[PDB]
């Protein structure tokens, strides 16, 4: 997500648009970490927010993780 | 209300003498009690303006009826409490309407005694035939008497004799113009009016004069820090400073003469 968002906006954003039933919604915020370019000038990355959407239904693990490799 | 001569079990208890502060008879309340910031001799801008002053373990405030005009019922005394800055006792006072307050007590009182305020002459207190420690008008008083907390007719608060063991003896009485001539603790004289008001009898703790601290830590725990001579000090810091401990004239650090005729 964009970290400006909030849960009750996320809730109706999904149920209206993708139309999937949910029991619970969670939220976690992260800060973009600092790194170094090739020429060794610093630059900060972007801040982002994570959402752990809990559902009623079953899910296939193709969306839950990456393939077994 | 009595002195304690201590047995010299230490160096500081050899000469010490202090008063029984009567903790069993002090039922403490949260009705009249504030503890303010301790002012260590400083302004609001933090600068010291009066020296030799600091922390006080015995800081408090207890609100008192110096002026007891507002009620005339008879009263008793339930308890007591001690004040530090003047080393005076006080006592609660329960009026017949179950009211409550603190007062300045006089010497010779204690729990169980009665006290009131008086609008009218003395024969018309059928209760409280004894008269000590009562709020009374100066005209409505005997020939001989002594007053301890005076409230002049042109005034709200009291400004004289508020300390321990003090009083104001009478020299004259002029009922014509209603003008009395009272003596102060120093000896000076002042015109007062018989429409004014005061208490009867000396204030509590006549016996502070017969006291010995005996320990520096009894003053440190009041807000009295350590003084320093002007002679140990360097010449920058004090106008006596130097190696000579003799000095014409004898001065103050801001610059002015302390000892006159001298």
């Amino acid at each position: 997500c964009d970290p400006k968002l909030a849960k009750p906006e996320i809730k109706q954003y999904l149920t209206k648009l993708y139309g999937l039933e949910l029991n619970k919604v969670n939220t976690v915020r992260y800060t973009g970490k600092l790194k170094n370019s090739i020429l060794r000038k610093t630059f900060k990355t972007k801040d982002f927010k994570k959402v752990y959407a809990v559902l009623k239904t079953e899910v296939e693990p193709f969306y839950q993780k990456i393939e077994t490799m | 209300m009595f002195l304690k001569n201590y047995k010299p079990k230490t160096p500081t208890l050899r000469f010490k003498r202090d008063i029984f502060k009567m903790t069993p008879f002090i039922k403490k309340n949260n009705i009249f009690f504030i503890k303010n910031k301790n002012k260590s001799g400083r302004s609001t801008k933090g600068q010291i303006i009066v020296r030799h002053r600091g922390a006080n373990k015995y800081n408090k405030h207890l609100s008192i009826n110096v002026n007891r005009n507002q009620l005339t019922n008879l009263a008793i005394i339930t308890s007591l409490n001690y004040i530090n800055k003047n080393s005076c006792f006080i006592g609660l006072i329960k009026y017949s309407n179950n009211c409550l307050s603190y007062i300045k007590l006089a010497n010779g009182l204690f729990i169980g005694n009665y006290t009131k305020s008086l609008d009218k002459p003395l024969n018309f207190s059928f209760n409280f035939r004894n008269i000590l420690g009562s709020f009374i008008i100066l005209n409505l008083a005997p020939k001989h008497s002594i007053f301890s907390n005076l409230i002049s007719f042109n005034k709200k608060k009291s400004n004289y004799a508020k300390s321990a063991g003090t009083f104001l003896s009478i020299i004259k009485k002029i009922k014509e113009i209603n003008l009395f001539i009272l003596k102060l603790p120093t000896g000076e004289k002042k015109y007062f009016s018989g429409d004014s008001k005061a208490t009867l009898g000396r204030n509590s703790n006549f016996l502070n004069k017969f006291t010995v601290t005996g320990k520096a830590g009894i003053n440190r725990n009041k807000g009295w820090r350590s003084s320093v001579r002007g002679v140990a000090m360097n010449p920058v810091d004090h106008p006596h400073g130097g190696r000579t401990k003799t000095n014409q004239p004898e001065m103050s650090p801001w610059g002015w003469i302390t000892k006159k005729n001298k």
Binding site: - | F2, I34, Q70, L71, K94, N107, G108, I111, G112, N127
Partner: protein
């Protein structure tokens, strides 16, 4: 309009000259050469100055001249209010010329009267003429502010002088306070002379009298309301374990009652 003090109030309305927050924006500013007091008052263009004091050996040092000031309250016949005013001795010299104060504010040019406060009063004094239905409840900087108590004693107000119980806090406790003669009623003045005479002749005091019969009933009711609190006290001393400390105090408290008996 060449006066900088006129440009500021220039575009104000009959409705914006009342907003006190906005006027204070204009009176609490700083002008180029004029002081910050000289706009709070009506000096007639006068300001202090500096210069060089001298000596015998011709040394020199900064010295400050200053301007006379005459703090004063004046009444404006138009506005029907009093106004504080600081002013020089040239204003007094002139107010008598133009006649009254409401003509000084209202005939001078702002170039000579270099105050802002003198032009704020001017415009409040023209609108009142152009509309006598103009309500001016409060004039700005008209009078100072007086508090009740100092800043130190703001704390001690918190706790009550006498605590009254719930049944009694709001009743008429008025006959109970101690009564000086000028405060007290007609009947009580007459009763006082009766009380004033029998003090000298207590043989005449009996319960067969209205006043004494009136009082003795009252006072004995007060005593009877205290005996419960008395009994609660004497129990405390009774169940108190140490008696030497008690007998010690009674030796002291007697020393006070003896003095009071034999005063001299």
């Amino acid at each position: 309009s060449i006066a900088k003090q006129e440009q500021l109030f220039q575009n104000f309305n009959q409705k914006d000259i009342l907003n006190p927050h906005l006027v204070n924006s204009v009176l609490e500013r700083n002008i180029q050469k004029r002081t910050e007091r000289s706009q709070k008052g009506l000096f007639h263009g006068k300001q202090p100055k500096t210069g060089l004091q001298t000596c015998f050996s011709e040394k020199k040092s900064i010295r400050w001249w200053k301007v006379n000031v005459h703090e004063k309250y004046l009444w404006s016949d138009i506005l029907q209010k009093k106004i504080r005013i600081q002013m020089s001795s040239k204003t007094l010299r002139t107010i008598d010329k133009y006649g009254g104060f409401d003509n000084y504010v209202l005939l001078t040019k702002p170039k000579n009267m270099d105050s802002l406060y003198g032009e704020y009063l001017r415009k409040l004094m023209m609108f009142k003429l152009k509309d006598p239905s103009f309500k001016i409840p409060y004039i700005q900087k008209s009078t100072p502010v007086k508090h009740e108590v100092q800043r130190r004693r703001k704390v001690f107000l918190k706790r009550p002088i006498v605590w009254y119980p719930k049944e009694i806090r709001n009743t008429d406790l008025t006959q109970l306070r101690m009564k000086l003669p000028h405060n007290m009623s007609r009947k009580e003045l007459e009763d006082f002379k009766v009380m004033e005479d029998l003090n000298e002749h207590p043989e005449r005091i009996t319960m067969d009298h209205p006043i004494v019969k009136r009082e003795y009933e009252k006072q004995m009711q007060e005593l009877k309301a205290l005996e419960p609190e008395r009994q609660k006290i004497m129990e405390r001393l009774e169940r108190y374990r140490s008696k030497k400390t008690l007998e010690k105090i009674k030796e002291v408290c007697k020393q006070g009652l003896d003095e009071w008996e034999n005063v001299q």
